[PDB]
Nucleic acid binder design. Structure first.
Ligand SMILES: [Cl-]
Ligand SMILES: [Cl-]
Lengths: 114, 114
DNA sequence: AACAA
DNA sequence: AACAA
């Protein structure tokens, strides 16, 4: 089963302009009912560049706690609906506390917090 | 200026699987601070198929009220970060009341309503 | 297992 | 100015 908070490897290419491209981890952010029934999921891109602009839609995840290659950043300004066929290996899954930070960053990203 | 609630024509192709494809209207759902400063926006796809599965992430918009070709549906389960270069003509913009419905549907889509 | 408030 | 809870 695909669950919200799961992290999968996925290929985001091809892309245009400053849409996040390439093969990378992505975190599932769609609700679990959609994750059960739909052929598609919604994800946010993850990157290993810790020197990006300091944007309020960024959430850090630590290499130690998760089975990561390096300290990474979830980009809640870089969100895609992907067909499940794009999802390859499940790499890890985020903690409840970390997902609360993701939820907050999504509220900001999408202007839902008024 | 690109504003949240604006509707633009955009080309979503190429896509994979059941990711929404093709040239179609899209609604800006990213916050207005990002819309000012970022080269990218976040959008939801719009479709003219009023016979889709009845999903709680769907929000109807009426042909009369907006300058539309036909009664349409906003698919809050089909959301993309797009480079602004993808945005062509501004077709219309949604009312405050309609955007409240969009906000609610996004909360559902992304499981933010617990 | 990129670049760009 | 598609298909698929
Ligand atoms: Cl390009
Ligand atoms: Cl395909």
């Amino acid at each position: 089963p695909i669950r919200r908070g799961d992290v999968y490897l996925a290929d985001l290419s091809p892309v245009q302009g400053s849409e996040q491209g390439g093969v990378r981890p992505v975190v599932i952010i769609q609700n679990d009912t959609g994750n059960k029934y739909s052929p598609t999921v919604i994800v946010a891109a993850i990157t290993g560049r810790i020197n990006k602009a300091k944007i309020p839609t960024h959430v850090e995840i630590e290499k130690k706690k998760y089975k990561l290659d390096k300290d990474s950043v979830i980009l809640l300004e870089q969100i895609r609906t992907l067909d499940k066929k794009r999802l390859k290996e499940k790499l890890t899954y985020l903690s409840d506390d970390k997902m609360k930070e993701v939820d907050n960053a999504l509220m900001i990203s999408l202007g839902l917090n008024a």
